[PDB]
Design an enzyme around this catalytic site. Structure first.
Site, PDB file in Angstrom:
ATOM      1  N   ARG A 299      41.092  36.689  49.941  1.00 54.47           N
ATOM      2  CA  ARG A 299      42.061  37.601  49.269  1.00 54.47           C
ATOM      3  C   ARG A 299      41.340  38.526  48.298  1.00 54.47           C
ATOM      4  O   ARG A 299      41.500  39.748  48.345  1.00 54.47           O
ATOM      5  CB  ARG A 299      43.114  36.787  48.505  1.00 54.47           C
ATOM      6  CG  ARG A 299      44.123  37.630  47.716  1.00 54.47           C
ATOM      7  CD  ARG A 299      45.481  36.925  47.607  1.00 54.47           C
ATOM      8  NE  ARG A 299      46.528  37.789  47.052  1.00 54.47           N
ATOM      9  CZ  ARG A 299      47.693  37.349  46.579  1.00 54.47           C
ATOM     10  NH1 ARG A 299      47.971  36.051  46.590  1.00 54.47           N
ATOM     11  NH2 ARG A 299      48.585  38.207  46.097  1.00 54.47           N
TER      12      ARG A 299
ATOM     13  N   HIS B 143      46.787  31.195  36.005  1.00 52.42           N
ATOM     14  CA  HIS B 143      47.182  32.542  35.596  1.00 52.42           C
ATOM     15  C   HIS B 143      46.044  33.364  34.993  1.00 52.42           C
ATOM     16  O   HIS B 143      45.031  32.818  34.557  1.00 52.42           O
ATOM     17  CB  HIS B 143      48.334  32.477  34.593  1.00 52.42           C
ATOM     18  CG  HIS B 143      48.828  33.822  34.162  1.00 52.42           C
ATOM     19  ND1 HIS B 143      48.784  34.925  34.990  1.00 52.42           N
ATOM     20  CD2 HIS B 143      49.364  34.247  32.995  1.00 52.42           C
ATOM     21  CE1 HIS B 143      49.273  35.972  34.348  1.00 52.42           C
ATOM     22  NE2 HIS B 143      49.631  35.587  33.136  1.00 52.42           N
ATOM     23  N   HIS B 144      46.222  34.682  34.978  1.00 54.18           N
ATOM     24  CA  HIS B 144      45.230  35.596  34.426  1.00 54.18           C
ATOM     25  C   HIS B 144      45.803  36.305  33.206  1.00 54.18           C
ATOM     26  O   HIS B 144      46.852  36.935  33.289  1.00 54.18           O
ATOM     27  CB  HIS B 144      44.824  36.629  35.474  1.00 54.18           C
ATOM     28  CG  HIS B 144      43.695  36.188  36.349  1.00 54.18           C
ATOM     29  ND1 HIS B 144      43.838  35.989  37.704  1.00 54.18           N
ATOM     30  CD2 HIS B 144      42.401  35.911  36.063  1.00 54.18           C
ATOM     31  CE1 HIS B 144      42.681  35.609  38.217  1.00 54.18           C
ATOM     32  NE2 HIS B 144      41.791  35.553  37.242  1.00 54.18           N
TER      33      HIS B 144
ATOM     34  N   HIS C 123      54.865  30.531  34.454  1.00 52.90           N
ATOM     35  CA  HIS C 123      54.275  31.718  35.054  1.00 52.90           C
ATOM     36  C   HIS C 123      55.369  32.693  35.452  1.00 52.90           C
ATOM     37  O   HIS C 123      55.292  33.882  35.154  1.00 52.90           O
ATOM     38  CB  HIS C 123      53.439  31.350  36.279  1.00 52.90           C
ATOM     39  CG  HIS C 123      52.367  32.345  36.592  1.00 52.90           C
ATOM     40  ND1 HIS C 123      51.925  32.588  37.874  1.00 52.90           N
ATOM     41  CD2 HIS C 123      51.653  33.167  35.788  1.00 52.90           C
ATOM     42  CE1 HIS C 123      50.985  33.516  37.847  1.00 52.90           C
ATOM     43  NE2 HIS C 123      50.801  33.885  36.592  1.00 52.90           N
TER      44      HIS C 123
ATOM     45  N   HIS D 252      56.218  36.646  33.173  1.00 52.39           N
ATOM     46  CA  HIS D 252      55.976  37.696  34.150  1.00 52.39           C
ATOM     47  C   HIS D 252      57.191  38.625  34.110  1.00 52.39           C
ATOM     48  O   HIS D 252      58.189  38.247  33.452  1.00 52.39           O
ATOM     49  CB  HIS D 252      55.806  37.093  35.555  1.00 52.39           C
ATOM     50  CG  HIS D 252      54.379  36.816  35.933  1.00 52.39           C
ATOM     51  ND1 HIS D 252      53.394  37.778  35.882  1.00 52.39           N
ATOM     52  CD2 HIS D 252      53.773  35.684  36.361  1.00 52.39           C
ATOM     53  CE1 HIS D 252      52.244  37.251  36.259  1.00 52.39           C
ATOM     54  NE2 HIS D 252      52.446  35.980  36.555  1.00 52.39           N
TER      55      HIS D 252
END
Ligand SMILES: [Zn+2]
EC number: 3.1.-.-
Lengths: 127, 87
Positions: free
Chosen positions: A1, A98-99, A123, A127
């Site tokens: 990816r 998560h980033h 998450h 978001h």
């Protein structure tokens, strides 16, 4: 990816309740002990990373002892541990990576100091 | 495999077999088959804890298939619900 790269970061110090209860928020950091193992290593894709992230997490005698035998088997093959029924959302029933700084703005895909472990409910929430 | 739609069709030995299947699917490449058996375990046992019985065992029992079976029996008997098949 994603595209390859070298993991970087200092990680953060955690106790023996890493994911369960948090001393800070609803997001748990990359144990510094873990960051020390993945630092300066290249991964074909971020998935290759998360895959190895969980592997190491199961090699650490202090953090693994905090997971059931079943959740331990999952991480040993590279899968995220299952969350508790109350932290699940939809078909997502596993812990997510998560980033903090989106791969968009300043990227930082393997920046272990840019990655935090969270629950779907979270998450999806953050978001 | 042979999936029964009720906890009373399952003998204890048989339910323990379903737990090993799950454990097996637990380490498989994907969670595709595993998530299906887990939804079944959840529905046939009817325990409010759900999957937590497998992944987040109570510190008051063993973290094992036997420990799991025990908790289901205890909670089912204590709530007036049919148990595991006898034979
Ligand atoms: Zn995210």
């Amino acid at each position: 990816r994603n595209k390859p790269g070298k993991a970087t970061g200092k990680g953060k110090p955690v106790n023996n309740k890493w994911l369960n209860n948090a001393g800070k928020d609803l997001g748990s950091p990359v144990p510094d002990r873990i960051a020390n193992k993945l630092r300066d290593k290249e991964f074909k894709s971020f998935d290759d990373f998360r895959k190895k992230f969980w592997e190491e997490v199961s090699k650490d005698p202090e953090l693994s002892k905090q997971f059931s035998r079943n959740n331990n088997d999952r991480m040993k093959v590279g899968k995220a541990p299952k969350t508790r029924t109350q932290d699940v959302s939809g078909k997502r029933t596993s812990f997510e990576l998560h980033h903090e700084k989106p791969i968009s703005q300043n990227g930082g895909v393997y920046d272990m100091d840019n990655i935090s472990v969270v629950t779907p409910k979270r998450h999806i929430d953050i978001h | 495999m042979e999936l029964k739609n009720s906890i009373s069709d399952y003998t204890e030995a048989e339910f323990v077999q379903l737990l090993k299947e799950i454990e097996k699917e637990n380490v498989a490449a994907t969670d595709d088959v595993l998530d299906v058996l887990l939804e079944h375990f959840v529905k046939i046992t009817e325990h409010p804890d759900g999957t937590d019985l497998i992944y987040y065992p109570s510190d008051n029992r063993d973290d094992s298939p036997e420990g799991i079976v025990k908790e289901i029996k205890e909670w089912r008997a204590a709530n007036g619900k049919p148990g595991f098949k006898q034979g």
